[PDB]
């Protein structure tokens, strides 16, 4: 949804609350501004301003984990109901908390992000807590590839 | 604390967490080497609450990083206690204020050159004067690994 | 049979249950360490530990600093073949357990076998030859080997936290070897530029040019004398370098004949340690060689000089008797520092 | 399911300096722990306080971090005013009197923020609080707002030292007063994380590993750190071809050798066979076919 | 990896002559080390006619220096490896001392394994960042074969752009060249 | 101990053979049958034999001499 | 010196008409043929160098340049040889162990030589 | 990869020919001290004896008198009592390398000599009477004797490995045996 | 949000649906200190009130039974410790920050030396928070050139 | 063995100078090869004992881990050329072990393209010719003309299977069939290339161009190099390999 509306902006659609679909609209749009580029219309985007990021949260991060195990869950859920829908058990026929178990570990260990808590100072310690980096899934995908960054 | 200040030690210490908060607390009646009873006014008391406040921290926790933790009191007993008040001093911690340095009375004028531009030189009574004598903790498990033998 | 095509490489050649194929017969001469096992081969060591770092402030170059606490760490069977033709060690068992011991006389004998064999260090990144270098060991008891100064460019550190070389030449040949190219003193000058590598980087060119300098003219600059006593008024009062123009009978025995010595009285006026270092130095160059501020710059090219006049061993005891004299008169001026030795001109105040 | 049980023991380890310790200072600046002499070398200062940590001087300028004369110029003012209220202490002056002493040193300066003695602090609040300030002056500074040089220079007048500082002293070796009469103060060290003790490594002959008989296993316990490739080349560039060939083949894994050149060591004779390499014989062995490439040398 | 000292003396008088680098204002680098320690060829001879500063091989340790800034002769031609003749490692007459072994380089010797890092020696290396004539100072013109043609003007225009002068004060040492296009018209 | 090696690099002048030439005179030593003919001040074979060449008697020449003359005398 | 090698031809000039002919084994040919035997016997050939990494195919000692960034083809090519390492590089003979006619092991080389010389 | 991996006498095998050949010895004095060392049991005592290794050679210049002499110097090298053969007499070198200022050192010696016998039984009262010594004269004797380097290596001389293929295996899921 | 986006479940054509009602998060196990020191994953179980309904068949909606009384539990959820710390298999680990570019499509150049024919071009690149990344590139060519994914 | 010696002669030391190393014939490797094992087992723990014939087997690939035989015959380092009755092993010193690669004939090779098509088909390039058809020469779904004047095919002619069995319900027995053991590489070693050498030279002479010049002088000099050579060309796919040592193959 902010995605949408970062994608109204740009074409400059007033209505920037939108869905993560797409539509040939905007493609038609985005491709006529690109030719106006093309030909003179603005100048490029820029990577280094403040404006053209969007961080991510632990919490997020967790929600992120916790919906795209239930994508999966989702999808269990409907294949069993699709064979022998003729039941009336309870809704456990397909709650698996192992599969929520450990995706919640693979998200909150098996990460890069994630590490040892490092106090050897208290204000290291904090530090380390007040980490702010580009690397994981995301950001700083790869190490090489750039130097004005 | 270092001599010199630069006005965010306290909150530091406050921040990093490690001491113990007075959350809610009036006043530090029975406080031990690891007991502290602590009983807050009948207002801070709140209702259904003696407002008698027990720590109990674990003393000199070996640190991730092989060092040493310990929660050091600064208050006995008996004494008229702020609430969300700093209990007891975690490491690099001295009068609530995380300083991990110690400042010692030097002079700065190359000496019989016995030390280079990246050298230390420092006397026999400091060296008794157990100024940053480390305290390391280091751990060795043991397991009882059942065999059919 | 064929080079390739064996471990299933035909078709099917993938290892049982492993995604991944096993080493097929198609490749299984080459496994893939080959060429690259020989490289890492040439890029690997085992053994004779090494790493430290520290400062030798004593222990002038024809030496090498130590640790004895490692020490003989590896020179144990050097040190147990001492012992058991010593007899201190009448069996194999026997010196394990005096070594387990310890013993004083352990000590000595290690003692004895190191002044007989020096040993060769090198430093943490491999630049130049001027890294490595051969040098007499002596125990230290220190955690860090510590190096006279004179190496200080040779191995490209800044005495900072670094790790060393340590090196055992257990041949015959290779102690020779080492005492002859990896020989400290057998290098002077960088043999790559030609220049002379070895130069007093550090304060003690300061401690010279102090020496060699008035600060404008001091109690008693005009003394007149002969030398003799200079070190003891110097040290004590009556004169200073920061004394201008002190006379002083000037006797230098130049090399003037061919290989042979000629001396001459002069009266230079000068300061109090400009006169004092120039008796410090060797006979050959001139005393206005010597007299002048003592420059850094003026110093390597003194060292030049009588590099290309007198010679090797003159040259290095020379270099550590300055090295030692720098540290002295370094120590004399204490020169510590602060805020108001930088003075803003206010003028910048009206330009800007 | 593998142990029925698990026992951990846990042990501390107590730590003092040691030779060519690491120093620290949140002025940027490091220094590696040299030497310690007697008391006696410190040279003694006019109240004869001998020399406590000596810098070199040569280093600063080409820091240009004023930081260390920062830091002594208020360490040094730290430690005066708490010199002096001890001093009233052993002389248990008046806790008024104290209190005022106190406030006229806290009042003064350029106007930051607001404290008022005599007034807030209880009487017995005030003698805790200059108990707990026994060892210095209390300072803070903005990190880019704080106080006036000058009234650092002032405050070392009002603490009865010198304003730049700058103070001779006498030897401690043999007791020359040392010219350019130094500035100094309370300067803070701090340590690394790496320690001397640690980075102690060394080996003789260590246990082989299981492969190719080398020193490791991921235990730092006689290991043996590998060579540099160009490290090898300026061996090389030795021309020490012994000396090479010994790096290669006494400082390596096969203790196959090592017989012979351990009785070699022990019998003094340090000498090693030519033959051919360890390589060389595995190679020879695993031999696709024979050899067309000439076989005859020196 | 080819480096070797075998051959004692190459025999062959060819060579390379080294000259002052006179490089931007003036001598960049004068010619009084670039190849002190070195035999030249015959090639050293003194700057008066007849008159011959050294033999054919004399490494120049340093009269010869002396000798050679007095007679203010700027080249002499002067043996070198590759042209060192040995097809073979090189000659030793053409390999020198060069370092503080103050004899020539030993038989067997290896100065590109001396070298092979002699240039990597600059790890810390530093990249990724006609009409205005002027004369130094006194000198000559020295044209160095310019095609003087009938110009416009009274003078003779530079037919070829090779218009390179040589501000040479007093002798063969030169200050400045001001070389000038074909373009361009002489002034002086 | 000797602190420069120079006198040896005089005495040969190729300064390859004086290092071979020391290795040479101490493995003799070591082994046995040669006496130093330089007086011993407690110091390393290699060392005495290093001395005694830059002394000028001890070279390639005179050590294979001797060894020919002992060599036929048996 | 080393930034050129293997220089190329054009006359057989009954050596052989070919084109990267090592520029020391023409000369040393060119010394004991034309001047020796046959003057007529002269090729012509042009001098060449190239990057180094280019150089880096050719070389001598059959071990080296094989190792130093593929082997598998290189291998292949010198089979096809059969030619003779020859422990041309003192870094071959280190590899092997020979002794690199180095400093002290250009003696050990050469005392080798003299001995292999009388057998 | 060419050989695995393993340590000096890693089955109880190596250890002992590595402290021979770190020791002076012949030719025929190291090939005598290899015969009693690879012919060593899992038990650590020399399986087959200096007579088996000869017949097995079939050598003259390998006597026995050459391979007792080699098994005498590597009597205890690494560890005491190797290649041990029958041990009763490596019990005897453990005694006598062990200080011989232990108390009761005769006693131990008196017993280990040629009082096995009685010991055997454990009828100390009857060994003491056919000693004619009091009885537990010698206990501190006989204690020192039961720790004296039984097989040497004895554990570590046991490499014995653990080697097993049951046709079948009994899980025991939940009783009533799961084959 | 995230249980919202995976709550709709249904057979395939089963005229089954799933649902849920509301999350009964369990209490923790171990004291944070007693999870420490006996080194568990300190976590807080999760138990989500499911709804099963099961529609009669050709009845429109006709729903014949309700499971809505299932507490589907999936798994433990690891607190985020009051001092913040992660507890993962006990250990005081801490996932570092992400910071992404901001969803959406990007007005970037992609010009210079890239073209490596003196050509500006116009290129702009779409960065969707989900879905495949992409951009459009102009040629030297004066032509528009898409990518996908 | 008086022992006097073999603990001598077990250290020995060569000059190991100018090393050789190329291509051979099967002989040598047939010299190289010691024994034969069967079974693919590495090691069991049934009895914890050697496998027979199988991965490092008993009397292959070098000695034992000690003097003492795997089945226990003449267990003893002092037995020198006793061989077990039980089982036929060095009863030695284990460097053998390490020195003991088999090999196996079999008699039947295949395509050794990790040479023949090295990089750009190094081996392949030599040949030149028909590089690709000579690297399907094999498959042995071909026969191949090798020879038959009285048929209509060269010896040198390409006949498929179907196109040699065409061949055959034709022309009789008037035409040959090479596959199998190297194929028609096999009639190609039985072949010599002095006369397609002295036609590469004759061709680079005359057909001189940007492309005629280039790929047959190229031909030639492999011709010219190769008969300097002159080794067993069959070598590329041989009748004998190497088996891996019981210490050449770990664990």
Redesign the interface.
């Known amino acids: 949804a902010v995605g949408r509306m970062k994608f109204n902006r740009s074409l400059l659609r007033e209505e920037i609350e939108g869905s993560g679909i797409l539509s040939k609209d905007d493609i038609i749009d985005v491709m006529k501004k690109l030719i106006d580029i093309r030909n003179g219309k603005g100048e490029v985007d820029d990577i280094d301003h403040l404006g053209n990021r969007r961080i991510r949260s632990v919490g997020e991060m967790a929600e992120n984990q916790f919906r795209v195990g239930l994508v999966r869950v989702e999808r269990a859920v409907k294949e069993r109901l699709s064979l022998g829908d003729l039941d009336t058990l309870m809704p456990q026929d397909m709650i698996n908390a192992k599969p929520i178990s450990a995706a919640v570990k693979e998200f909150f260990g098996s990460s890069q992000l994630s590490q040892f808590m490092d106090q050897n100072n208290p204000l290291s310690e904090i530090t380390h807590k007040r980490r702010i980096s580009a690397l994981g899934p995301g950001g700083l995908t790869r190490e090489r590839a750039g130097f004005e960054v | ?7 965010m ?1 306290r909150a ?2 406050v ?4 001491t113990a908060v007075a959350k809610r607390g009036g006043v530090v009646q029975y406080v031990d080497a690891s007991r502290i009873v602590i009983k807050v006014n009948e207002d801070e008391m709140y209702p259904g609450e003696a407002g008698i406040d027990i720590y109990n921290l ?1 003393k ?1 926790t ?4 092989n ?3 310990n929660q050091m009191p600064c208050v006995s007993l008996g004494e008229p206690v702020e609430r969300g008040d700093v209990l007891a001093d ?4 001295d ?1 609530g204020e ?1 300083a ?28 008794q004067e ?1 100024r ?15 065999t059919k ?1 | 049979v064929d080079a390739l095509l064996d471990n299933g490489r035909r078709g099917r050649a993938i290892t049982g249950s492993n995604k991944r194929p096993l080493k097929s017969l198609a490749d299984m001469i080459k496994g893939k360490q080959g060429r690259f096992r020989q490289n890492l081969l040439g890029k690997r060591v085992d053994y004779s530990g090494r790493s430290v770092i520290t400062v030798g402030p004593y222990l002038r170059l024809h030496q090498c600093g130590l640790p004895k606490k490692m020490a003989l760490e590896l020179f144990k069977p050097f040190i147990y073949g001492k012992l058991e033709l010593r007899g201190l060690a009448t069996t194999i068992k026997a010196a394990k357990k005096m070594v387990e011991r310890e013993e004083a006389v352990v000590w000595d004998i290690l003692d004895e076998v190191i002044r007989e064999h020096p040993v060769l260090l090198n430093r943490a990144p491999t630049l130049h030859r001027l890294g490595i270098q051969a040098f007499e060991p002596v125990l230290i008891e220190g955690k860090a080997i510590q190096l006279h100064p004179l190496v200080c460019a040779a191995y490209n550190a800044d005495f900072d936290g670094d790790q060393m070389a340590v090196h055992v030449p257990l041949t015959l040949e290779a102690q020779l070897e080492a005492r002859a190219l990896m020989m400290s003193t057998n290098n002077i000058l960088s043999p790559a530029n030609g220049e002379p590598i070895i130069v007093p980087s550090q304060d003690v060119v300061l401690g010279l040019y102090y020496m060699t300098r008035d600060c404008v003219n001091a109690k008693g600059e005009g003394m007149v004398l002969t030398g003799p006593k200079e070190a003891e008024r110097l040290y004590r009062s009556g004169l200073a370098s920061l004394h201008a123009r002190v006379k002083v009978r000037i006797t230098e025995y130049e090399k003037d004949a061919n290989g042979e010595l000629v001396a001459k009285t002069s009266l230079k006026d000068t300061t109090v340690g400009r006169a004092i270092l120039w008796m410090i130095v060797p006979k050959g160059l001139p005393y206005s060689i010597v007299n002048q501020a003592l420059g850094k710059k003026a110093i390597s090219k003194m060292l030049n000089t009588c590099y290309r006049i007198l010679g090797l061993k003159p040259t290095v005891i020379f270099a550590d008797q300055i090295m030692y004299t720098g540290f002295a008169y370094a120590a004399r001026s204490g020169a510590s520092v602060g805020i108001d030795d930088m003075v803003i001109p206010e003028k910048k105040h009206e330009i800007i | 399911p593998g142990v029925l049980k698990i026992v951990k023991v846990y042990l501390a380890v107590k730590r003092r300096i040691q030779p060519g310790d690491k120093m620290a200072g949140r002025h940027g600046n490091k220094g590696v722990i040299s030497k310690i002499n007697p008391i006696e070398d410190m040279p003694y200062d006019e109240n004869g306080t001998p020399v406590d940590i000596v810098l070199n001087p040569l280093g600063v300028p080409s820091r240009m971090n004023i930081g260390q004369i920062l830091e002594t110029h208020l360490g040094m003012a730290a430690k005066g005013i708490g010199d002096k209220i001890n001093a009233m202490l052993k002389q248990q002056q008046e806790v008024a009197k104290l209190r005022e002493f106190i406030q006229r040193a806290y009042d003064l300066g350029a106007d930051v923020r607001q404290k008022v003695d005599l007034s807030t602090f209880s009487d017995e609040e005030v003698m805790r609080l200059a108990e707990n300030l026994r060892k210095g002056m209390p300072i803070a500074t903005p990190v880019f707002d704080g106080a006036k040089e000058a009234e650092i220079k002032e405050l070392l007048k009002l603490g009865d030292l010198p304003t730049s500082g700058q103070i001779r002293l006498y030897d401690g070796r043999t007791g020359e007063q040392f010219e350019r009469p130094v500035t100094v103060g309370y300067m803070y060290m701090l340590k690394l994380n790496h320690l001397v003790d640690d980075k102690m490594h060394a080996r003789s002959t260590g246990s082989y590993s299981l492969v190719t008989q080398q020193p490791l296993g991921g235990k730092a316990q006689f290991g043996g750190q590998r060579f540099g490739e160009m490290e090898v080349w300026a061996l090389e560039a030795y021309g020490a071809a012994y000396t090479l060939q010994e790096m290669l083949t006494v400082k390596s894994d096969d203790v196959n050798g090592r017989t012979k050149m351990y009785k070699n060591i022990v019998d003094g004779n340090h000498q090693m066979e030519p033959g051919m390499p360890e390589s060389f014989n595995v190679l020879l062995k695993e031999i696709r076919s024979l050899g067309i490439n000439i076989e005859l040398e020196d | 990896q080819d480096l070797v000292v075998t051959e004692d003396d190459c025999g062959t008088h060819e060579g390379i002559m080294m000259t002052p680098v006179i490089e931007g204002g003036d001598v960049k680098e004068p010619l009084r080390d670039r190849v002190l320690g070195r035999v030249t060829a015959e090639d050293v001879l003194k700057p008066g006619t007849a008159d011959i500063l050294v033999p054919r091989n004399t490494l120049l340790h340093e009269q010869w220096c002396d000798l050679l800034e007095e007679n203010s002769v700027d080249a002499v031609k002067v043996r070198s490896v590759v042209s060192c003749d040995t097809d073979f490692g090189v000659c030793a007459h053409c390999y020198g001392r060069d370092l503080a072994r103050g004899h020539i380089i030993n038989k067997g010797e290896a100065i590109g394994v001396i070298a092979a890092q002699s240039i990597g020696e600059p790890g810390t290396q530093l990249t990724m960042r006609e009409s205005s004539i002027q004369v130094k100072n006194k000198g000559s013109i020295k044209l160095s074969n310019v095609k003087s043609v009938v110009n416009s003007s009274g003078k003779l225009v530079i037919t070829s752009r090779n218009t390179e002068l040589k501000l040479i004060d007093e002798f063969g040492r030169t200050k400045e060249s001001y070389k000038v296009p074909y373009g361009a018209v002489l002034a002086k | 101990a000797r602190v420069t090696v120079q006198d040896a690099v005089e005495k040969i002048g190729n300064r390859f053979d004086l290092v071979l030439v020391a290795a040479r005179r101490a493995r003799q030593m070591q082994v046995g049958g040669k006496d130093p003919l330089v007086p011993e001040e407690n110091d390393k074979t290699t060392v005495i034999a290093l001395r005694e060449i830059e002394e000028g008697l001890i070279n390639n020449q005179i050590l294979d001499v001797r060894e020919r003359q002992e060599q036929q005398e048996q | 010196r080393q930034m050129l090698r293997k220089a190329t031809i054009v006359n057989a000039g009954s050596s052989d008409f070919l084109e990267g002919e090592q520029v020391e084994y023409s000369r040393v040919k060119i010394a004991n043929r034309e001047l020796e035997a046959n003057g007529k016997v002269g090729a012509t050939y042009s001098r060449d160098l190239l990057g180094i990494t280019k150089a880096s195919l050719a070389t001598e000692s059959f071990i080296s340049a094989a190792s130093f960034q593929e082997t598998t083809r290189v291998l292949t090519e010198a089979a096809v040889a059969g030619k003779r390492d020859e422990l041309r590089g003192l870094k071959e003979n280190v590899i092997v162990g020979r002794l690199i006619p180095a400093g002290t092991g250009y003696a050990y080389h050469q005392d080798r030589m003299r001995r292999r010389a009388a057998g | 990869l060419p050989v695995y991996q393993g340590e000096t006498t890693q089955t109880l095998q190596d250890y002992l020919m590595w402290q021979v050949e770190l020791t002076p010895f012949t030719d025929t004095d190291r090939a005598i001290a290899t015969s009693i060392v690879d012919a060593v049991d899992d038990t650590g005592y020399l399986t087959i004896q200096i007579e088996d290794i000869v017949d097995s050679i079939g050598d003259d210049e390998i006597g026995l008198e050459e391979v007792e002499a080699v098994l005498k110097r590597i009597q205890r090298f690494d560890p005491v009592g190797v290649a041990a053969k029958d041990l009763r007499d490596c019990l005897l070198i453990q005694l006598s390398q062990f200080a011989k200022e232990t108390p009761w050192l005769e006693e131990a010696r008196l017993i280990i000599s040629d009082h096995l016998d009685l010991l055997a039984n454990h009828d100390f009262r009857t060994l003491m009477r056919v000693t004619r010594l009091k009885e537990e004269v010698l206990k501190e004797a006989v204690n020192l004797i039961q720790s004296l380097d039984p097989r040497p290596g004895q554990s570590i001389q046991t490499s014995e490995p653990e080697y097993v293929i049951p046709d079948v295996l009994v899980r025991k899921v939940s009783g009533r045996w799961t084959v | 949000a995230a249980f919202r986006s995976v709550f709709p479940i249904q057979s395939y054509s089963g005229n089954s649906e799933l649902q849920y009602v509301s999350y009964r998060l369990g209490e923790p196990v171990f004291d944070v200190q007693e999870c420490q020191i006996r080194g568990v994953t300190y976590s807080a179980p999760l138990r989500v009130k499911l709804r099963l309904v099961i529609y009669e068949r050709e009845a429109p909606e006709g729903t014949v039974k309700d499971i809505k009384e299932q507490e589907v539990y999936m798994g433990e959820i690891p607190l985020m410790t009051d001092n913040g710390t992660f507890v993962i298999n006990g250990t005081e680990r801490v996932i570092v920050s992400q910071l992404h570019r901001s969803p959406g499509v990007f007005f970037d150049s992609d010009k210079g030396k890239t073209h490596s024919s003196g050509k500006v071009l116009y290129n702009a690149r779409i960065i969707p928070y989900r879905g495949s990344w992409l951009d459009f590139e102009f040629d030297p060519k004066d032509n528009l050139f898409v990518r996908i994914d | 063995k008086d022992l006097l010696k073999f603990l001598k002669a077990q250290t020995k030391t060569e000059e190991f100078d100018a090393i050789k190393i190329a291509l051979a014939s099967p002989d040598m490797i047939r010299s190289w090869s010691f024994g034969e094992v069967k079974k693919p087992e590495t090691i069991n723990y049934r009895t914890f004992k050697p496998e027979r014939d199988g991965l490092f087997c008993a009397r292959i690939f070098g000695p034992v881990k000690d003097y003492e035989c795997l089945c226990g015959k003449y267990k003893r380092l002092k037995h020198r050329g006793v061989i077990c009755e039980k089982c036929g092993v060095e009863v030695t010193q284990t460097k053998v072990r390490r020195e003991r690669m088999g090999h196996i004939e079999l008699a039947s090779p295949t395509a050794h393209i990790w040479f023949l098509k090295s990089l750009p088909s190094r081996i392949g390039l030599l040949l030149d010719m028909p590089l690709r058809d000579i690297e399907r020469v094999l498959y042995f779904e071909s026969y191949v003309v090798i020879e038959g004047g009285m048929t209509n095919l060269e010896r040198q002619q390409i006949l498929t299977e179907e196109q040699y069995l065409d061949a055959l319900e034709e022309f009789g027995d008037e035409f040959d069939a090479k596959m199998g053991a190297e194929a028609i590489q096999a009639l190609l070693k039985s072949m010599d290339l002095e006369q397609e050498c002295e036609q590469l030279r004759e061709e680079l002479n005359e057909t001189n161009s940007e492309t005629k010049r280039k790929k047959l002088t190229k031909r030639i000099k492999l011709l010219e190099a190769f008969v300097q050579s002159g080794n067993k060309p069959e070598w590329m796919i041989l009748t004998v390999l190497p088996v891996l040592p019981p210490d050449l193959r770990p664990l």
């Not at chain 2, 921040?15 to 490690?18: A, I, N, P, Y």
């Open positions: 604390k270092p001599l010199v200040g630069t006005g030690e530091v210490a921040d990093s967490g490690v674990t000199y070996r640190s991730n990083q060092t040493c933790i975690g490491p690099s911690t009068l995380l991990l340095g110690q400042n010692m009375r030097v002079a700065f004028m190359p000496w019989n050159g016995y030390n280079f531009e990246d050298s230390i030189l420092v006397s026999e009574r400091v060296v157990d940053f004598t480390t305290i390391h903790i280091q751990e060795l498990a043991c397991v009882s690994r059942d033998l």
